[PDB]
């Protein structure tokens, strides 16, 4: 598997205002079509890890978090795996206030 747009995938620092939505993408291809899982600060990102939970759209390779709160701060990492290899990218999320 391989990043489709490796130049956008160099971006790592993301800041977003509270109570809005953060969206992270990691688009890929890889024979056979790889699957994607998400990590938060190293650990597996699971639905109960934040209040709203999180939504996905695999078909557009994206993790989504609505209503962000200062505790959503941290590192988010997409893992893309097929039978033949795993690729790895981290975004860093910051939350702005007022």
């Amino acid at each position, epitope marked *: 598997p391989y990043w489709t*747009n490796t130049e*956008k995938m160099e*971006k790592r620092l*993301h800041a*977003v*205002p*509270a*109570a*809005n*939505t*953060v*969206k*992270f*993408r990691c688009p890929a291809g890889g024979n056979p079509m790889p699957t994607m899982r998400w990590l938060k600060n190293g650990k597996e990102f699971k639905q109960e890890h934040r209040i709203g939970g999180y*939504k996905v*759209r695999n078909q*557009h390779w*994206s993790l*989504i978090m609505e209503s962000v709160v200062p505790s959503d701060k941290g590192n988010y990492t997409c893992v893309v795996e097929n039978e033949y290899g795993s690729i790895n990218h981290t*975004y860093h999320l910051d939350v*702005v*206030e*007022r």
Partner: antibody
Amino acid sequence: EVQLVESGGGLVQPGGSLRLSCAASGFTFTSTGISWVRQAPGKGLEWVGRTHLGDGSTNYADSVKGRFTISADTSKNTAYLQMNSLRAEDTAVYYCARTYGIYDLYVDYTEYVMDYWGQGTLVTVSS
Amino acid sequence: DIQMTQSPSSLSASVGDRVTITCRASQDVDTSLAWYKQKPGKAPKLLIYSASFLYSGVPSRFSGSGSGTDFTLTISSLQPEDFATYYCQQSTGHPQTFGQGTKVEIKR
């Protein structure tokens, strides 16, 4: 309950001015935004403009730039549309909508979602 | 601008019917597309955002799909309160534009 109540509507003269108000309850928009969209009687929806307090951006439909001004008062939890130099074709129901953003590094823009609208106030411009 | 074209403009469907309304954009809008429902005299209500996300409180019989320049709003089993006018709206960095609307009448 999330509520948005619009007031300030009415019949006003061409060349004249009007201030619409958008009072919010059940939520604050200190870090989100407010949009205005209008609907001429019998017609479809027309975006008027938007201010986002979280990202600091303000933008208007070309048909409305420089005549209409969108502001907010956090103290009053209220948003405003100052309409100056009104013409007959500004005649419409004006809606305000709570507006948040989808922030994605992957693209060039903030995708804004107008998820909750007030019931609207009717503005009639006529001599 | 980014022109949005809805089809059909108006339609007559029976209760329980499956209804499809399509929205085409004059250029690629990705999945940056929202659908609104509006009953006459009231504010529009958001049904779907980002092409396929169902908004809170919106019944699951509404679903959205599409990307690029083609989008569809689906109503699987048309209920009596679903009779209204439906609007799509693209939400790119280009100035926001709406479709002209699709009005759904009740057949009897």
